Amino acid sequence: SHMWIGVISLFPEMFKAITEFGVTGRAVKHNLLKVECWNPRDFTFDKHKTVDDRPYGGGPGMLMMVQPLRDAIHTAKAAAGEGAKVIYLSPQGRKLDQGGVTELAQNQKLILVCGRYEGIDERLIQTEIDEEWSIGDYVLTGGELPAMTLIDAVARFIPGVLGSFADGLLDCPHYTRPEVLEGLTVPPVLMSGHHEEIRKWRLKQSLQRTWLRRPELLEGLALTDEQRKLLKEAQAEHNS
Amino acid sequence: SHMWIGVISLFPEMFKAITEFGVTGRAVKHNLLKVECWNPRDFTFDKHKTVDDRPYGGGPGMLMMVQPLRDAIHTAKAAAGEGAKVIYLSPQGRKLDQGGVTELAQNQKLILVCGRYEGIDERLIQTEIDEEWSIGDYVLTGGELPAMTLIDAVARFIPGVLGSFADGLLDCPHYTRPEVLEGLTVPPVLMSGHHEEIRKWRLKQSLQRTWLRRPELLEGLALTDEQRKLLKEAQAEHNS
Ligand SMILES: Nc1nonc1C(=O)N[C@@H]1CC[C@H](O)C1
Ligand SMILES: Nc1nonc1C(=O)N[C@@H]1CC[C@H](O)C1
Numbered sequence A, B: 001s002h003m004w005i006g007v008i009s010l011f012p013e014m015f016k017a018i019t020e021f022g023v024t025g026r027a028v029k030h031n032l033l034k035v036e037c038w039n040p041r042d043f044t045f046d047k048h049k050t051v052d053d054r055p056y057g058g059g060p061g062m063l064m065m066v067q068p069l070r071d072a073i074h075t076a077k078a079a080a081g082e083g084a085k086v087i088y089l090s091p092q093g094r095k096l097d098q099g100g101v102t103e104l105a106q107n108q109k110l111i112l113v114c115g116r117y118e119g120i121d122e123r124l125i126q127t128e129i130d131e132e133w134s135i136g137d138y139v140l141t142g143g144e145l146p147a148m149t150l151i152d153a154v155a156r157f158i159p160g161v162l163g164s165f166a167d168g169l170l171d172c173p174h175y176t177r178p179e180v181l182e183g184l185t186v187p188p189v190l191m192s193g194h195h196e197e198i199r200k201w202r203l204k205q206s207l208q209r210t211w212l213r214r215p216e217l218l219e220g221l222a223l224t225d226e227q228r229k230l231l232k233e234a235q236a237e238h239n240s
Helices: A012-019 A022-029 A066-080 A098-104 A122-128 A144-155 A195-213 A215-219 A225-238 B012-019 B022-029 B066-080 B098-104 B122-128 B144-155 B195-213 B215-219 B225-238
Strands: A003-008 A033-038 A085-095 A109-113 A131-134 B003-008 B033-038 B085-095 B109-113 B131-134
Touching: A003 A066, A003 A144, A012 A022, A012 A033, A012 A144, A012 B012, A012 B144, A022 A033, A022 A144, A033 A066, A033 A144, A066 A109, A066 A122, A085 A098, A085 A144, A098 A144, A109 A144, A131 A144, A144 B012, A144 B144, A195 A215, A195 A225, B003 B066, B003 B144, B012 B022, B012 B033, B012 B144, B022 B033, B022 B144, B033 B066, B033 B144, B066 B109, B066 B122, B085 B098, B085 B144, B098 B144, B109 B144, B131 B144, B195 B215, B195 B225
Parallel strands: A003 A033, A003 A109, A085 A109, A085 A131, B003 B033, B003 B109, B085 B109, B085 B131
Antiparallel strands: none
């Protein structure tokens, strides 16, 4: 299930971070994922290739200039053809979570608009953007890292790209060599070779860690009978 | 207030995305921000420079190999000297928000450990990591994008780096040229040159957008008298 992602960015070279390295770099090289960038600076006409503009109403800060950005977006939409969802990354957007990632991953084509400076004209959001998404409640210098984050997360859902959380829980602890590290030993159950006991231990650990660190995540879950039991056990041991 | 950030990563070249471009790239060039990377692959001793290892207990997936990663971390700590906070980026960590960013930005030195594969040995977290942080409740292919995200967010707090939210609200809409765009006009108040009316309009817009999109964010705020009034006005107009 190929995925095509168009990107509008003043700094297209930043995306080398995901297109040239690791799992996502392999996905691109194998044509499982295609990332195509358009730079508003290429759509300027003035001598100094101006890509920012002053906000009506004054105040400090600049906005992205409308014409170059708008033209870049239109060009990306033309290349994308029918059925591309246009996304603007910003703190005003829907909060991204794994459920949201799975939904976005259902799209065969995405166009990601990366804001810089104080952002983009509200009317462009109204006329060009299908959805607004945020990767988190913090403020960055640009939308590029959010876009790459989104790309990385959805890429994991593409068949062939890959060689807890899916039940809404934090991950269990992981152990590798050596058997003893600064006096700390690997839990014996992991050495037992008892697949069922290992499965239950990992699940119990996930339930316990979710409960201790992120109890609000549990309220949103319909635990299985097995999960209810193991969580009760973990809570009992914690209270022991 | 200089900031030094040590990074442990199998893909140090990804960090060119923030050290070579934009506001963060300028911060680095001007020595306001220093980013220094250590690669566990450089701390391997076997012919094929192995950086992953099999998890005790079996199951699919690999973990980062302990020895190369541990040695890389120790080297970064030695370079950092006293007072460096060591952070591991992972979904099991404290959820990052702007309040959390401000807290992290108080550190003069940070060391950021970027996990790959299924993660790192739990005992390394116990023995080497000061704090665990998450950039969001979604799953990525590596900790590098989270690390860069964290770096970008804290960099904004470094004096000289910069040329909604600080009151806990979403941003107001922004407008730039032209005055009319696809039939949509700039709100006349922004053209008035009345600084006080413009300030109040922007604040009212932020309150309204926070209320409509992220009402849970309001519950955590102690609104000023002015904010209470403007929010009431916005809600009244919405109900008109
Ligand atoms: N959080 C986020 N999720 O997506 N984007 C952001 C974000 O911080 N955007 C910044 C706002 C001003 C600057 O233009 C870029
Ligand atoms: N969310 C996050 N905030 O910090 N890090 C992550 C994250 O998804 N880490 C991945 C887990 C497995 C892989 O090793 C990298």
